[PDB]
Amino acid sequence: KIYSKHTPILVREPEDLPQGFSALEPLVDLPIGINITRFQTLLA
Amino acid sequence: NFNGLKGTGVLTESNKKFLPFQQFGRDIADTTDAVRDPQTLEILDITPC
């Protein structure tokens, strides 16, 4: 599972981490079979 | 017999909206009371006799 809050139109400076609790829903569920200990998300 | 669960009751229509990764609904007493039909994907409700 990968819980993502891809929130656009943020009327605020980036600055620091956002405040307030933020509920997230899962957006992926696929049968790998093993468990993951590393990754690399390509940045374009 | 919904995909494996055996019970008894009456099935009606409910307005609860399941998340896509969920299939069963519970209550206070931790017993199932809402199921999703495997063939057609509407949400039902379970109440006893």
PDB file of N, CA and C in Angstrom:
ATOM      1  N   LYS A   1       0.840  -1.185   0.000  1.00  0.00           N
ATOM      2  CA  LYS A   1       0.000   0.000   0.000  1.00  0.00           C
ATOM      3  C   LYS A   1       0.880   1.243   0.000  1.00  0.00           C
ATOM      4  N   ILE A   2       0.385   2.299  -0.626  1.00  0.00           N
ATOM      5  CA  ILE A   2       1.104   3.562  -0.745  1.00  0.00           C
ATOM      6  C   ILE A   2       0.065   4.648  -0.506  1.00  0.00           C
ATOM      7  N   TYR A   3       0.078   5.242   0.681  1.00  0.00           N
ATOM      8  CA  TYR A   3      -0.890   6.280   1.011  1.00  0.00           C
ATOM      9  C   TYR A   3      -0.308   7.608   0.561  1.00  0.00           C
ATOM     10  N   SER A   4      -1.049   8.306  -0.295  1.00  0.00           N
ATOM     11  CA  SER A   4      -0.593   9.531  -0.924  1.00  0.00           C
ATOM     12  C   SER A   4      -1.622  10.626  -0.708  1.00  0.00           C
ATOM     13  N   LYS A   5      -1.138  11.802  -0.313  1.00  0.00           N
ATOM     14  CA  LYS A   5      -1.978  12.997  -0.306  1.00  0.00           C
ATOM     15  C   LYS A   5      -1.387  13.954  -1.334  1.00  0.00           C
ATOM     16  N   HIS A   6      -1.743  13.745  -2.596  1.00  0.00           N
ATOM     17  CA  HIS A   6      -1.295  14.604  -3.687  1.00  0.00           C
ATOM     18  C   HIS A   6      -2.241  15.796  -3.730  1.00  0.00           C
ATOM     19  N   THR A   7      -2.025  16.763  -2.838  1.00  0.00           N
ATOM     20  CA  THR A   7      -2.948  17.881  -2.725  1.00  0.00           C
ATOM     21  C   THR A   7      -2.463  19.060  -3.561  1.00  0.00           C
ATOM     22  N   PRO A   8      -3.198  19.445  -4.602  1.00  0.00           N
ATOM     23  CA  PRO A   8      -2.842  20.634  -5.376  1.00  0.00           C
ATOM     24  C   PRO A   8      -3.418  21.897  -4.756  1.00  0.00           C
ATOM     25  N   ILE A   9      -3.276  22.995  -5.507  1.00  0.00           N
ATOM     26  CA  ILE A   9      -3.758  24.338  -5.178  1.00  0.00           C
ATOM     27  C   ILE A   9      -3.597  24.646  -3.693  1.00  0.00           C
ATOM     28  N   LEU A  10      -2.357  24.601  -3.210  1.00  0.00           N
ATOM     29  CA  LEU A  10      -2.029  24.905  -1.820  1.00  0.00           C
ATOM     30  C   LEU A  10      -1.752  26.401  -1.742  1.00  0.00           C
ATOM     31  N   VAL A  11      -2.667  27.149  -1.135  1.00  0.00           N
ATOM     32  CA  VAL A  11      -2.476  28.597  -0.949  1.00  0.00           C
ATOM     33  C   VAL A  11      -1.745  28.766   0.380  1.00  0.00           C
ATOM     34  N   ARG A  12      -0.429  28.575   0.328  1.00  0.00           N
ATOM     35  CA  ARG A  12       0.469  28.664   1.472  1.00  0.00           C
ATOM     36  C   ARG A  12       1.891  28.508   0.950  1.00  0.00           C
ATOM     37  N   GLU A  13       2.840  29.077   1.687  1.00  0.00           N
ATOM     38  CA  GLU A  13       4.240  28.863   1.381  1.00  0.00           C
ATOM     39  C   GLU A  13       4.626  27.425   1.713  1.00  0.00           C
ATOM     40  N   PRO A  14       5.551  26.837   0.946  1.00  0.00           N
ATOM     41  CA  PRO A  14       5.993  25.469   1.246  1.00  0.00           C
ATOM     42  C   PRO A  14       6.567  25.351   2.648  1.00  0.00           C
ATOM     43  N   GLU A  15       7.638  26.105   2.905  1.00  0.00           N
ATOM     44  CA  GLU A  15       8.209  26.263   4.238  1.00  0.00           C
ATOM     45  C   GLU A  15       8.525  24.926   4.897  1.00  0.00           C
ATOM     46  N   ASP A  16       7.597  24.426   5.712  1.00  0.00           N
ATOM     47  CA  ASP A  16       7.835  23.267   6.558  1.00  0.00           C
ATOM     48  C   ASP A  16       6.700  22.270   6.339  1.00  0.00           C
ATOM     49  N   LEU A  17       6.685  21.210   7.144  1.00  0.00           N
ATOM     50  CA  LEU A  17       5.637  20.205   7.035  1.00  0.00           C
ATOM     51  C   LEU A  17       4.283  20.803   7.411  1.00  0.00           C
ATOM     52  N   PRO A  18       3.206  20.378   6.756  1.00  0.00           N
ATOM     53  CA  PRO A  18       1.880  20.919   7.070  1.00  0.00           C
ATOM     54  C   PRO A  18       1.403  20.470   8.443  1.00  0.00           C
ATOM     55  N   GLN A  19       0.468  21.242   8.986  1.00  0.00           N
ATOM     56  CA  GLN A  19      -0.111  20.981  10.297  1.00  0.00           C
ATOM     57  C   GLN A  19      -1.455  20.283  10.137  1.00  0.00           C
ATOM     58  N   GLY A  20      -1.998  19.798  11.245  1.00  0.00           N
ATOM     59  CA  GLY A  20      -3.315  19.197  11.236  1.00  0.00           C
ATOM     60  C   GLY A  20      -3.258  17.768  10.729  1.00  0.00           C
ATOM     61  N   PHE A  21      -4.089  16.930  11.348  1.00  0.00           N
ATOM     62  CA  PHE A  21      -4.213  15.530  10.972  1.00  0.00           C
ATOM     63  C   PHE A  21      -4.757  15.443   9.554  1.00  0.00           C
ATOM     64  N   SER A  22      -4.247  14.480   8.788  1.00  0.00           N
ATOM     65  CA  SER A  22      -4.650  14.321   7.397  1.00  0.00           C
ATOM     66  C   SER A  22      -4.904  12.848   7.119  1.00  0.00           C
ATOM     67  N   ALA A  23      -6.176  12.479   7.007  1.00  0.00           N
ATOM     68  CA  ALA A  23      -6.542  11.117   6.660  1.00  0.00           C
ATOM     69  C   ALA A  23      -6.210  10.832   5.198  1.00  0.00           C
ATOM     70  N   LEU A  24      -5.664   9.643   4.954  1.00  0.00           N
ATOM     71  CA  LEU A  24      -5.252   9.227   3.614  1.00  0.00           C
ATOM     72  C   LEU A  24      -5.912   7.888   3.298  1.00  0.00           C
ATOM     73  N   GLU A  25      -6.254   7.682   2.031  1.00  0.00           N
ATOM     74  CA  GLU A  25      -6.756   6.388   1.600  1.00  0.00           C
ATOM     75  C   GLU A  25      -5.700   5.683   0.751  1.00  0.00           C
ATOM     76  N   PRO A  26      -5.642   4.349   0.785  1.00  0.00           N
ATOM     77  CA  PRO A  26      -4.684   3.642  -0.073  1.00  0.00           C
ATOM     78  C   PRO A  26      -5.043   3.778  -1.542  1.00  0.00           C
ATOM     79  N   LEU A  27      -4.035   3.757  -2.416  1.00  0.00           N
ATOM     80  CA  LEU A  27      -4.299   3.938  -3.839  1.00  0.00           C
ATOM     81  C   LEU A  27      -3.634   2.845  -4.666  1.00  0.00           C
ATOM     82  N   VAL A  28      -3.136   1.798  -4.008  1.00  0.00           N
ATOM     83  CA  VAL A  28      -2.487   0.691  -4.701  1.00  0.00           C
ATOM     84  C   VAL A  28      -2.574  -0.560  -3.833  1.00  0.00           C
ATOM     85  N   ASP A  29      -2.826  -1.705  -4.467  1.00  0.00           N
ATOM     86  CA  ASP A  29      -2.852  -2.991  -3.781  1.00  0.00           C
ATOM     87  C   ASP A  29      -2.606  -4.101  -4.797  1.00  0.00           C
ATOM     88  N   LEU A  30      -1.378  -4.620  -4.840  1.00  0.00           N
ATOM     89  CA  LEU A  30      -1.015  -5.616  -5.839  1.00  0.00           C
ATOM     90  C   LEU A  30      -0.167  -6.717  -5.212  1.00  0.00           C
ATOM     91  N   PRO A  31      -0.314  -7.961  -5.684  1.00  0.00           N
ATOM     92  CA  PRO A  31       0.352  -9.099  -5.029  1.00  0.00           C
ATOM     93  C   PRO A  31       1.819  -9.284  -5.398  1.00  0.00           C
ATOM     94  N   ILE A  32       2.721  -8.583  -4.708  1.00  0.00           N
ATOM     95  CA  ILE A  32       4.158  -8.751  -4.918  1.00  0.00           C
ATOM     96  C   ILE A  32       4.594 -10.165  -4.549  1.00  0.00           C
ATOM     97  N   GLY A  33       4.209 -10.622  -3.361  1.00  0.00           N
ATOM     98  CA  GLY A  33       4.634 -11.923  -2.879  1.00  0.00           C
ATOM     99  C   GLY A  33       5.726 -11.831  -1.835  1.00  0.00           C
ATOM    100  N   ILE A  34       6.657 -10.908  -2.036  1.00  0.00           N
ATOM    101  CA  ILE A  34       7.677 -10.615  -1.056  1.00  0.00           C
ATOM    102  C   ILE A  34       7.454  -9.201  -0.536  1.00  0.00           C
ATOM    103  N   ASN A  35       8.280  -8.790   0.414  1.00  0.00           N
ATOM    104  CA  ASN A  35       8.176  -7.478   1.028  1.00  0.00           C
ATOM    105  C   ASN A  35       9.397  -6.644   0.643  1.00  0.00           C
ATOM    106  N   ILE A  36       9.211  -5.327   0.633  1.00  0.00           N
ATOM    107  CA  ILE A  36      10.159  -4.398   0.033  1.00  0.00           C
ATOM    108  C   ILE A  36      10.958  -3.698   1.123  1.00  0.00           C
ATOM    109  N   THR A  37      12.254  -3.526   0.858  1.00  0.00           N
ATOM    110  CA  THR A  37      13.167  -2.936   1.829  1.00  0.00           C
ATOM    111  C   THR A  37      13.923  -1.749   1.239  1.00  0.00           C
ATOM    112  N   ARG A  38      13.742  -1.485  -0.054  1.00  0.00           N
ATOM    113  CA  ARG A  38      14.346  -0.320  -0.691  1.00  0.00           C
ATOM    114  C   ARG A  38      13.402   0.175  -1.774  1.00  0.00           C
ATOM    115  N   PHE A  39      13.783   1.261  -2.451  1.00  0.00           N
ATOM    116  CA  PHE A  39      13.078   1.730  -3.640  1.00  0.00           C
ATOM    117  C   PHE A  39      13.878   2.868  -4.264  1.00  0.00           C
ATOM    118  N   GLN A  40      13.383   3.371  -5.393  1.00  0.00           N
ATOM    119  CA  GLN A  40      13.896   4.574  -6.025  1.00  0.00           C
ATOM    120  C   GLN A  40      12.806   5.130  -6.928  1.00  0.00           C
ATOM    121  N   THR A  41      12.203   6.236  -6.516  1.00  0.00           N
ATOM    122  CA  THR A  41      11.157   6.874  -7.301  1.00  0.00           C
ATOM    123  C   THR A  41      11.797   7.893  -8.231  1.00  0.00           C
ATOM    124  N   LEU A  42      11.788   7.592  -9.527  1.00  0.00           N
ATOM    125  CA  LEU A  42      12.412   8.466 -10.511  1.00  0.00           C
ATOM    126  C   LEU A  42      11.786   9.852 -10.455  1.00  0.00           C
ATOM    127  N   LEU A  43      12.628  10.878 -10.461  1.00  0.00           N
ATOM    128  CA  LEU A  43      12.178  12.261 -10.519  1.00  0.00           C
ATOM    129  C   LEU A  43      12.503  12.825 -11.897  1.00  0.00           C
ATOM    130  N   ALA A  44      11.473  13.279 -12.603  1.00  0.00           N
ATOM    131  CA  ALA A  44      11.640  13.763 -13.969  1.00  0.00           C
ATOM    132  C   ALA A  44      12.178  15.178 -13.960  1.00  0.00           C
TER     133      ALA A  44
ATOM    134  N   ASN B   1     -25.157 -17.576   1.267  1.00  0.00           N
ATOM    135  CA  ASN B   1     -23.751 -17.980   1.301  1.00  0.00           C
ATOM    136  C   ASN B   1     -23.007 -17.007   0.386  1.00  0.00           C
ATOM    137  N   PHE B   2     -22.492 -15.934   0.976  1.00  0.00           N
ATOM    138  CA  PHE B   2     -21.876 -14.843   0.221  1.00  0.00           C
ATOM    139  C   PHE B   2     -20.367 -15.045   0.232  1.00  0.00           C
ATOM    140  N   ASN B   3     -19.857 -15.685  -0.821  1.00  0.00           N
ATOM    141  CA  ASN B   3     -18.419 -15.817  -1.058  1.00  0.00           C
ATOM    142  C   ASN B   3     -17.720 -16.611   0.044  1.00  0.00           C
ATOM    143  N   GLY B   4     -18.488 -17.290   0.890  1.00  0.00           N
ATOM    144  CA  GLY B   4     -17.938 -18.099   1.963  1.00  0.00           C
ATOM    145  C   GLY B   4     -18.655 -17.986   3.293  1.00  0.00           C
ATOM    146  N   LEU B   5     -19.277 -16.853   3.611  1.00  0.00           N
ATOM    147  CA  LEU B   5     -19.946 -16.654   4.894  1.00  0.00           C
ATOM    148  C   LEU B   5     -21.322 -17.304   4.848  1.00  0.00           C
ATOM    149  N   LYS B   6     -21.657 -18.053   5.893  1.00  0.00           N
ATOM    150  CA  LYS B   6     -22.978 -18.643   6.029  1.00  0.00           C
ATOM    151  C   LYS B   6     -23.750 -17.908   7.115  1.00  0.00           C
ATOM    152  N   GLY B   7     -24.985 -17.531   6.809  1.00  0.00           N
ATOM    153  CA  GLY B   7     -25.784 -16.805   7.766  1.00  0.00           C
ATOM    154  C   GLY B   7     -27.262 -17.027   7.542  1.00  0.00           C
ATOM    155  N   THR B   8     -28.050 -16.074   8.032  1.00  0.00           N
ATOM    156  CA  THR B   8     -29.501 -16.112   7.924  1.00  0.00           C
ATOM    157  C   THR B   8     -30.049 -14.732   8.251  1.00  0.00           C
ATOM    158  N   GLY B   9     -30.923 -14.228   7.389  1.00  0.00           N
ATOM    159  CA  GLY B   9     -31.493 -12.915   7.599  1.00  0.00           C
ATOM    160  C   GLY B   9     -32.204 -12.436   6.350  1.00  0.00           C
ATOM    161  N   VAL B  10     -32.398 -11.123   6.292  1.00  0.00           N
ATOM    162  CA  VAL B  10     -33.068 -10.467   5.176  1.00  0.00           C
ATOM    163  C   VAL B  10     -32.134  -9.412   4.600  1.00  0.00           C
ATOM    164  N   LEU B  11     -32.053  -9.365   3.273  1.00  0.00           N
ATOM    165  CA  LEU B  11     -31.121  -8.497   2.567  1.00  0.00           C
ATOM    166  C   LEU B  11     -31.865  -7.306   1.982  1.00  0.00           C
ATOM    167  N   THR B  12     -31.366  -6.104   2.265  1.00  0.00           N
ATOM    168  CA  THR B  12     -31.965  -4.874   1.763  1.00  0.00           C
ATOM    169  C   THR B  12     -30.909  -3.990   1.112  1.00  0.00           C
ATOM    170  N   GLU B  13     -31.278  -2.759   0.780  1.00  0.00           N
ATOM    171  CA  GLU B  13     -30.351  -1.811   0.181  1.00  0.00           C
ATOM    172  C   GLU B  13     -29.876  -0.804   1.218  1.00  0.00           C
ATOM    173  N   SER B  14     -28.583  -0.494   1.170  1.00  0.00           N
ATOM    174  CA  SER B  14     -27.977   0.440   2.105  1.00  0.00           C
ATOM    175  C   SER B  14     -27.209   1.501   1.332  1.00  0.00           C
ATOM    176  N   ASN B  15     -27.058   2.670   1.955  1.00  0.00           N
ATOM    177  CA  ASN B  15     -26.402   3.804   1.325  1.00  0.00           C
ATOM    178  C   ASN B  15     -24.938   3.957   1.710  1.00  0.00           C
ATOM    179  N   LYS B  16     -24.386   3.045   2.504  1.00  0.00           N
ATOM    180  CA  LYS B  16     -22.979   3.134   2.867  1.00  0.00           C
ATOM    181  C   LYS B  16     -22.103   2.912   1.640  1.00  0.00           C
ATOM    182  N   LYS B  17     -20.988   3.635   1.584  1.00  0.00           N
ATOM    183  CA  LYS B  17     -20.097   3.598   0.432  1.00  0.00           C
ATOM    184  C   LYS B  17     -18.768   2.971   0.835  1.00  0.00           C
ATOM    185  N   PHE B  18     -18.537   1.741   0.384  1.00  0.00           N
ATOM    186  CA  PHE B  18     -17.309   1.017   0.675  1.00  0.00           C
ATOM    187  C   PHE B  18     -16.145   1.622  -0.095  1.00  0.00           C
ATOM    188  N   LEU B  19     -14.959   1.583   0.506  1.00  0.00           N
ATOM    189  CA  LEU B  19     -13.746   1.896  -0.225  1.00  0.00           C
ATOM    190  C   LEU B  19     -13.378   0.713  -1.120  1.00  0.00           C
ATOM    191  N   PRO B  20     -12.656   0.959  -2.218  1.00  0.00           N
ATOM    192  CA  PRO B  20     -12.451  -0.105  -3.218  1.00  0.00           C
ATOM    193  C   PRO B  20     -11.700  -1.324  -2.704  1.00  0.00           C
ATOM    194  N   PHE B  21     -10.965  -1.221  -1.599  1.00  0.00           N
ATOM    195  CA  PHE B  21     -10.208  -2.349  -1.073  1.00  0.00           C
ATOM    196  C   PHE B  21     -10.943  -3.079   0.046  1.00  0.00           C
ATOM    197  N   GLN B  22     -12.220  -2.773   0.265  1.00  0.00           N
ATOM    198  CA  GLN B  22     -12.995  -3.349   1.353  1.00  0.00           C
ATOM    199  C   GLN B  22     -14.125  -4.209   0.803  1.00  0.00           C
ATOM    200  N   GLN B  23     -14.467  -5.258   1.552  1.00  0.00           N
ATOM    201  CA  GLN B  23     -15.566  -6.140   1.174  1.00  0.00           C
ATOM    202  C   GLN B  23     -16.597  -6.369   2.269  1.00  0.00           C
ATOM    203  N   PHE B  24     -16.227  -6.338   3.547  1.00  0.00           N
ATOM    204  CA  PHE B  24     -17.150  -6.645   4.628  1.00  0.00           C
ATOM    205  C   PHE B  24     -17.279  -5.455   5.567  1.00  0.00           C
ATOM    206  N   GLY B  25     -18.467  -5.313   6.148  1.00  0.00           N
ATOM    207  CA  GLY B  25     -18.716  -4.289   7.142  1.00  0.00           C
ATOM    208  C   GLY B  25     -19.059  -4.887   8.489  1.00  0.00           C
ATOM    209  N   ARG B  26     -18.630  -4.242   9.571  1.00  0.00           N
ATOM    210  CA  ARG B  26     -18.839  -4.772  10.909  1.00  0.00           C
ATOM    211  C   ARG B  26     -19.647  -3.779  11.730  1.00  0.00           C
ATOM    212  N   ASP B  27     -19.861  -4.130  12.992  1.00  0.00           N
ATOM    213  CA  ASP B  27     -20.627  -3.316  13.924  1.00  0.00           C
ATOM    214  C   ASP B  27     -19.954  -3.336  15.296  1.00  0.00           C
ATOM    215  N   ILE B  28     -20.705  -2.902  16.310  1.00  0.00           N
ATOM    216  CA  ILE B  28     -20.171  -2.825  17.667  1.00  0.00           C
ATOM    217  C   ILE B  28     -19.783  -4.209  18.171  1.00  0.00           C
ATOM    218  N   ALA B  29     -20.641  -5.203  17.939  1.00  0.00           N
ATOM    219  CA  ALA B  29     -20.405  -6.546  18.451  1.00  0.00           C
ATOM    220  C   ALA B  29     -19.431  -7.349  17.599  1.00  0.00           C
ATOM    221  N   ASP B  30     -18.819  -6.730  16.589  1.00  0.00           N
ATOM    222  CA  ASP B  30     -17.832  -7.384  15.727  1.00  0.00           C
ATOM    223  C   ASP B  30     -18.439  -8.592  15.013  1.00  0.00           C
ATOM    224  N   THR B  31     -19.593  -8.369  14.390  1.00  0.00           N
ATOM    225  CA  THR B  31     -20.226  -9.346  13.518  1.00  0.00           C
ATOM    226  C   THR B  31     -20.616  -8.656  12.220  1.00  0.00           C
ATOM    227  N   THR B  32     -20.486  -9.378  11.110  1.00  0.00           N
ATOM    228  CA  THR B  32     -20.718  -8.782   9.802  1.00  0.00           C
ATOM    229  C   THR B  32     -22.185  -8.403   9.631  1.00  0.00           C
ATOM    230  N   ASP B  33     -22.422  -7.228   9.040  1.00  0.00           N
ATOM    231  CA  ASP B  33     -23.782  -6.762   8.800  1.00  0.00           C
ATOM    232  C   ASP B  33     -23.929  -6.087   7.439  1.00  0.00           C
ATOM    233  N   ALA B  34     -22.867  -6.050   6.638  1.00  0.00           N
ATOM    234  CA  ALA B  34     -22.929  -5.471   5.303  1.00  0.00           C
ATOM    235  C   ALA B  34     -21.956  -6.193   4.383  1.00  0.00           C
ATOM    236  N   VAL B  35     -22.425  -6.597   3.202  1.00  0.00           N
ATOM    237  CA  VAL B  35     -21.619  -7.360   2.262  1.00  0.00           C
ATOM    238  C   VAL B  35     -21.774  -6.764   0.872  1.00  0.00           C
ATOM    239  N   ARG B  36     -20.815  -7.086   0.010  1.00  0.00           N
ATOM    240  CA  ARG B  36     -20.851  -6.693  -1.390  1.00  0.00           C
ATOM    241  C   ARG B  36     -20.972  -7.940  -2.254  1.00  0.00           C
ATOM    242  N   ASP B  37     -21.987  -7.970  -3.106  1.00  0.00           N
ATOM    243  CA  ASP B  37     -22.227  -9.131  -3.956  1.00  0.00           C
ATOM    244  C   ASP B  37     -21.069  -9.304  -4.930  1.00  0.00           C
ATOM    245  N   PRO B  38     -20.440 -10.480  -4.994  1.00  0.00           N
ATOM    246  CA  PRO B  38     -19.270 -10.640  -5.874  1.00  0.00           C
ATOM    247  C   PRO B  38     -19.553 -10.419  -7.351  1.00  0.00           C
ATOM    248  N   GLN B  39     -20.733 -10.793  -7.847  1.00  0.00           N
ATOM    249  CA  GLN B  39     -20.983 -10.707  -9.284  1.00  0.00           C
ATOM    250  C   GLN B  39     -21.292  -9.275  -9.710  1.00  0.00           C
ATOM    251  N   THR B  40     -22.380  -8.711  -9.197  1.00  0.00           N
ATOM    252  CA  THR B  40     -22.682  -7.297  -9.367  1.00  0.00           C
ATOM    253  C   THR B  40     -22.368  -6.577  -8.061  1.00  0.00           C
ATOM    254  N   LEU B  41     -21.717  -5.418  -8.165  1.00  0.00           N
ATOM    255  CA  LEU B  41     -20.952  -4.858  -7.056  1.00  0.00           C
ATOM    256  C   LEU B  41     -21.720  -3.814  -6.251  1.00  0.00           C
ATOM    257  N   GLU B  42     -23.021  -3.999  -6.047  1.00  0.00           N
ATOM    258  CA  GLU B  42     -23.738  -3.124  -5.133  1.00  0.00           C
ATOM    259  C   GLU B  42     -23.505  -3.566  -3.688  1.00  0.00           C
ATOM    260  N   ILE B  43     -23.915  -2.709  -2.757  1.00  0.00           N
ATOM    261  CA  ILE B  43     -23.727  -2.943  -1.330  1.00  0.00           C
ATOM    262  C   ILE B  43     -25.072  -3.280  -0.708  1.00  0.00           C
ATOM    263  N   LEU B  44     -25.138  -4.416  -0.025  1.00  0.00           N
ATOM    264  CA  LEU B  44     -26.341  -4.847   0.667  1.00  0.00           C
ATOM    265  C   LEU B  44     -26.202  -4.607   2.166  1.00  0.00           C
ATOM    266  N   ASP B  45     -27.260  -4.953   2.896  1.00  0.00           N
ATOM    267  CA  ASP B  45     -27.287  -4.816   4.346  1.00  0.00           C
ATOM    268  C   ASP B  45     -27.924  -6.067   4.929  1.00  0.00           C
ATOM    269  N   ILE B  46     -27.516  -6.437   6.138  1.00  0.00           N
ATOM    270  CA  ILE B  46     -27.991  -7.660   6.773  1.00  0.00           C
ATOM    271  C   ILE B  46     -28.612  -7.320   8.120  1.00  0.00           C
ATOM    272  N   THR B  47     -29.862  -7.740   8.317  1.00  0.00           N
ATOM    273  CA  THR B  47     -30.537  -7.617   9.597  1.00  0.00           C
ATOM    274  C   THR B  47     -31.153  -8.973   9.903  1.00  0.00           C
ATOM    275  N   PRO B  48     -31.221  -9.369  11.171  1.00  0.00           N
ATOM    276  CA  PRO B  48     -31.732 -10.702  11.504  1.00  0.00           C
ATOM    277  C   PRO B  48     -33.227 -10.812  11.245  1.00  0.00           C
ATOM    278  N   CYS B  49     -33.766 -11.973  11.608  1.00  0.00           N
ATOM    279  CA  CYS B  49     -35.173 -12.256  11.389  1.00  0.00           C
ATOM    280  C   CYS B  49     -36.039 -11.462  12.365  1.00  0.00           C
TER     281      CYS B  49
END
